[PDB]
Amino acid sequence: KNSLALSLTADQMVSALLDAEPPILYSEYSMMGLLTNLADRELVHMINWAKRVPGFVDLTLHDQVHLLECAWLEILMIGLVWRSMEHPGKLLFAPNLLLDRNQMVEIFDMLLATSSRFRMMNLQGEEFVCLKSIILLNSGVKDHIHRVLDKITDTLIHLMAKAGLTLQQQHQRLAQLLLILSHIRHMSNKGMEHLYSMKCKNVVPLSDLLLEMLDAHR
């Protein structure tokens, strides 16, 4: 199978995932209207980010739209959680949009708990970009995608070994990170439910791209 991912070394993979990183967008000037507008613009960058993720392009088109349809809210959330790490108790949706929980609130608290966990774990940026690529490829549902996931796994381990963590600490930290992905899947599913009810209530207009990704959950 033609693939750039399986050709890359561990450090080349990290370097590629770092260079593929999307930018931190700003909010414009209700609250959910701002977040909707923000998430919509972030989705445009995510799509092109995914195309820069090693292995994603080598997948068929229909597999590409499928993973994005499944993971888009997971990817938005882990990005939000990452940005909010240095702001414990608050969520940094944008540099000009720092929010507390009392300004959907149950989901806000879950994001705060995730941000606090990442922060006390001292999650690194190189580990973070690995987690996002894992989320993207594990959202659908040896297979090619499973081979890539195995390699990103080797990448996480490789990063931890360079950090100076023992073999025991690597397996434990790897487990800690991947278990958080389960909670990220939870937040995404819950957010998806509320966003569709939000569509039915006609109170804030979901964008074209957002309406589309929503209809996919199906």
């Binding site: 799509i47 092109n48 088109l61 739209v65 994005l68 349809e69 791209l209 589309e212």
Partner: peptide, 9 residues
């Protein structure tokens, strides 16, 4: 769909 328009272009 917008997805496979941005995904191609």
């Amino acid at each position: 769909k917008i997805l496979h328009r941005l995904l191609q272009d």
